[PDB]
Every structure is written in C-alpha cells, then in structure tokens.
Amino acid sequence: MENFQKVEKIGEGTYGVVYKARNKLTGEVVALKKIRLGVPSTAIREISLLKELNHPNIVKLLDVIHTENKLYLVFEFLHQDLKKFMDASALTGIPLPLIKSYLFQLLQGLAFCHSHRVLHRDLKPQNLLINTEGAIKLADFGLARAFGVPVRTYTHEVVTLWYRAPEILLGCKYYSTAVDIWSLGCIFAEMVTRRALFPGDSEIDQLFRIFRTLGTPDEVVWPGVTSMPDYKPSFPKWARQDFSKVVPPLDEDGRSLLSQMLHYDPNKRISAKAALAHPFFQDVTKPVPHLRL
C-alpha cells in the first residue's frame, strides 16, 4: 500500500514476507508482515485479539489491515533477532547476567500471555527480538492452527522442530502453555552452550534426540504417555543422561530451573510464573548487549 514505503525485506516468515517500512505520513518506522489471502473468522478475531495483548516483552502489534486480497500486520520495529545475536556472540558466549536477564524477561512475557489464555506455540531464537536497551521481546505468535500446515506457507521455507515439545511430537491435539516453557528451556540451554540442545532434522529424529538425552519416557515419569496418538511401544528405550553433561558449565540453580522446564509431563513442567520465583533469578539484573546495527 501507499501508506507505507518499503525500506528493505528483513525476513520471510511462516505466513508471509516481512519488510522494514515507514509510515508514509507519520514517518514512524515499523515491521510490516504481508500475507496473501474471505479471511478466517477463527483468524480474523484471534488476530484482532493479539492487538489487545500489550506487554514490554511482547512485540507490539500496531495494526491489522485486511485489503485487496491481502492481510497486513504492522508491528513495532526492533533492532535484531536473538539468533543473529547468538551467532555474533558465539566466540565468547553471551555473558551469564545477560542470559539471565533475557530468560527472566521472556518468562515475564510468557506469564502475561498465559494468564491471558494466549499461547505462542512456536518459540525459537529467530522469533525473539532485542534492542539496545537490553530488552527482549516475543515475536510472531503462532496461530492456532488457523494456519496449520496447511501444507506450508503459501510460500517456501523449511520449519524448525528443534524447540518442539514432546507432547506435540507425540500427537497431543490439545497441548497447553507448557509447550512454550519447553521451547524456552531449549532456548535457555542453547544460549548457555552455544549450540542447539535438540537439533532434529525430522519429527522422529527430533523425538529420538530428546529421548537419547532425557531418557525414553514411560508411565513412571509421564502418566498417559504410552496412550498418546503417536506413541509406539517399538520406540527405543534410552537411559536418561546425567544433566551435568547437558548444559555445562551452567551452575546448579540454572540446571535446576532448566530441568523443571524440560519435564516430560506437561502437568509437572514448571509454569512461567513459578519460574520467575526460582532462586536462579535472585541476583537478576538488566545489562545491555553490545549491538552492531
């Protein structure tokens, strides 16, 4: 539209292409997501919902514009995503106080969403955006299957399984807020180690990498697991590996928190609100990253 002047393409999302743009009138600089293609009532009002969802740690959805066979999502613009910051910090690692600040802020964001009855569903470093003032924000919230598959985007681009909760992988249709805690645990481990916790290249490889590390789940640690739609008694039975080899050299408070975020049983997995009270955050501060923009 002529409301916005394209600056550059900044990404190709899971629903459409994203541009940096400026409001041709106000001069405001925003991120503009363009999705080609009635618009589902299921969607049209769960999206207009997301506009009400305002929090310092959630990327502000400024406007939703349905026009000429397209839907535009107008967002506040941030400096950089977490994935880029992680790749640029790979030599020395992100300093623990910054890791801790980011984790704390994201748990605040999640606690807010979840208390509002909103799930993200697709948490990953790519979907987290940061600024110069040390803030980190949840971006590109996943739609409830309003867009599922459908096969792909109406466009190209492969999807990451690395942060998917095991109950999703096992066919649970009615998964809960616990799925975001799982993904955030995986992101936490990755910030610490500089390397993806569970980098699977297929759904079964993803599952089996989780099992190989955390032990194949059974009715002891996860009641009802063997009755899950995609569970197979033929799954190999791996022993749980000791947790100290998983995220060294993270301290015991960190490891304790992470283990509670990676509980197999979604009903025993720690909540975002309870995680905020974990001793790990007793000395939490808000450092600023050094950002090359």
Swiss-Prot record:
Recorded consequence of changing K9F = Reduced phosphorylation by CAK
Q: What is its main location?
A: cytoplasm
Query: One GO term of the cellular component aspect?
Result: cyclin-dependent protein kinase holoenzyme complex
Which residues, renumbered to this chain, carry the PTM Phosphotyrosine? Y15, Y19
Describe what upregulates or represses it: Induced transiently by TGFB1 at an early phase of TGFB1-mediated apoptosis.
**Residues that bear N-acetylmethionine:** M1
Q: Which residues bind Mg(2+)?
A: N127, D140
Q: Which keywords label this protein? A: Acetylation, ATP-binding, Cell cycle, Cell division, Cytoplasm, Cytoskeleton, DNA damage, DNA repair, Endosome, Kinase, Magnesium, Meiosis, Metal-binding, Mitosis, Nucleotide-binding, Nucleus, Phosphoprotein, S-nitrosylation, Serine/threonine-protein kinase, Transferase
Q: How is it modified after translation?
A: Phosphorylated at Thr-155 by CDK7 in a CAK complex. Phosphorylation at Thr-155 promotes kinase activity, whereas phosphorylation at Tyr-15 by WEE1 reduces slightly kinase activity. Phosphorylated on Thr-14 and Tyr-15 during S and G2 phases before being dephosphorylated by CDC25A.
Reactions it catalyzes: L-seryl-[protein] + ATP = O-phospho-L-seryl-[protein] + ADP + H(+); L-threonyl-[protein] + ATP = O-phospho-L-threonyl-[protein] + ADP + H(+)
Q: Which residues carry this modification: N6-acetyllysine?
A: K6
Primary enzyme class: transferase
Q: Its quaternary structure? A: Found in a complex with CABLES1, CCNA1 and CCNE1. Interacts with CABLES1. Interacts with UHRF2. Part of a complex consisting of UHRF2, CDK2 and CCNE1. Interacts with the Speedy/Ringo proteins SPDYA and SPDYC. Interaction with SPDYA promotes kinase activation via a conformation change that alleviates obstruction of the substrate-binding cleft by the T-loop. Found in a complex with both SPDYA and CDKN1B/KIP1. Binds to RB1 and CDK7.
Q: What does this protein do?
A: Serine/threonine-protein kinase involved in the control of the cell cycle; essential for meiosis, but dispensable for mitosis. Phosphorylates CABLES1, CTNNB1, CDK2AP2, ERCC6, NBN, USP37, p53/TP53, NPM1, CDK7, RB1, BRCA2, MYC, NPAT, EZH2. Triggers duplication of centrosomes and DNA.
Q: What is the protein named?
A: Cyclin-dependent kinase 2
> Native species of this protein?
Homo sapiens (Human)
